[PDB]
Amino acid sequence: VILTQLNEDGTTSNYFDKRKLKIAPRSTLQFKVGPPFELVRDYCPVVESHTGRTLDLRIIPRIDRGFDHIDEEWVGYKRNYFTLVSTFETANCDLDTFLKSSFDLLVEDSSVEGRLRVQYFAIKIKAKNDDDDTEINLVQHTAKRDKGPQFCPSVCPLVPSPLPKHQTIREASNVRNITKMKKYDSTFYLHRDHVNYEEYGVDSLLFSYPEDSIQKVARYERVQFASSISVKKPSQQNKHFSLHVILGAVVDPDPGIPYDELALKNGSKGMFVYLQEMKTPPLIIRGRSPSNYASSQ
DNA sequence: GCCACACAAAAAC
DNA sequence: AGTTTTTGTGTGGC
C-alpha cells in the first residue's frame, strides 16, 4: 500500500495511491520527493563583463509535495497542493565574487558592443501539456487558502545557492514563530542592506537586484493546477502534463532570442531573457471525481 | 463542471 | 497541556 524510497538527506518519500488509502492532511507522509527534472535546453550565454569568462549555470530544482510515483507514473491531484523549489548554481564561481562582478548577455558574438547588461537573475515556473506544448494556468494560495488571496506564480529574483535538503523544506513550510524564522533566514534570504556597501562598486550585480531582500531559494508552495483544467483527453486517456523551471536574466528593454516581458520595479517593461530550462517527465493529474478517492470504496 | 463552505486530524506554538 | 493553524477531502448549490 505504501512504497518507500530513501531521499538524499535520509528522510523517506512514501508513495501511496489516494484512490486506495486516505492519510491525514498534515501527516508527514504527504511530503515526498516528486519527479526528477531534466534539461530542456540552454539559451543565451552570459559572460563576465571584465574577464569575458562564460558563466556556467545549472538549475537545481525539486518537488517536495503533491506527486506520487504510482505504477511507473507520476501522479498529482487537481484539488491538492504541490511544492516546487529551485536554486541555481554557477560552477567554479563563488557567491562573494559573483555579487561584486557584472555580467552581459552575449546575444551576438563578434560584437563587443552587442551585449545587454544583466540586472539580475530570476526563476519562473510554468505548467504545460507535455504532448502539445500548450501552457496550463497554475494558481497559488496563502496558508489561509479561501480566506486569503489567490495569485499566479511570480518571477523570483534569486542569487546562486545550494538547494536545501527535503527535510529543511518540510521544516520551514509553516513557520510563524519569530525565533524559528530567524533560524531559517540565512538559508532562504540574502539581505543586501546588511552587507558592507564600501566593498561594492555602483555597477555590481548585487546592487542591480530590485529589492534589498533577495531570495536564495525560489519556493513555490501551495500551488495547484487551475480548477478549470481538463485532465483527460476526449478518448478518456489521461492528459500528460509537465512542470517547467526557467532561469532567466532580467535586462532593460532599451531581439532574436527567447524572452518574456516582465513588469519592472521602475514601471517600465523589462525583459526576462531565457538562459536555461528544465522540465519534469510526464505527469498525470487526477480530477475531483469521487472515483479518485478511497471514500468511494 | 466549478465554487463555496464544511469537517477533521496533525502540525505549530 | 492547552488553543490555533493548515490542508486533504466530503458535500451542496447552481
From Swiss-Prot:
Residue ranges for the DNA-binding region feature of this UniProt entry: 1-297
Effect of R26A: Reduces DNA-binding by 65%
Reported effect, K78A: No effect on DNA-binding but strongly reduces progress through meiosis and sporulation
Upregulating conditions: Induced during prophase I of meiosis. Requires protein kinase IME2 for initial expression and continued transcription during meiotic divisions. Can autoactivate its own synthesis.
Origin superkingdom: Eukaryota
Effect of R222A: Reduces DNA-binding by 93% and abolishes sporulation
Post-translational modification: Phosphorylated by pachytene checkpoint kinase IME2, but also phosphorylated in an IME2-independent manner. Phosphorylation probably eliminates SUM1-mediated repression and is also required for full transcriptional activation activity. Phosphorylation of the DNA-binding domain by IME2 does not alter DNA binding affinity.
Effect noted on mutating R176A: Reduces DNA-binding by 50% and abolishes sporulation
Subcellular location: Nucleus
Site (Interaction with DNA): R26, R79, R145, R176, R222, R288
Subunit relationships: Binds to DNA as a monomer.
Physiological role: Transcription factor required for successful completion of meiosis and spore formation. Gets activated after completion of meiotic recombination at the end of prophase I. Recognizes and binds to the middle sporulation element (MSE) 5'-C[AG]CAAA[AT]-3' in the promoter region of stage-specific genes that are required for progression through meiosis and sporulation. Competes for binding to MSE with the transcriptional repressor SUM1, which represses middle sporulation-specific genes during mitosis and early sporulation.
Protein name: Meiosis-specific transcription factor NDT80
Species whose genome carries this gene: Saccharomyces cerevisiae (strain ATCC 204508 / S288c) (Baker's yeast)
Phylogenetic classification of the source organism: Eukaryota, Fungi, Dikarya, Ascomycota, Saccharomycotina
Gene that encodes it: NDT80
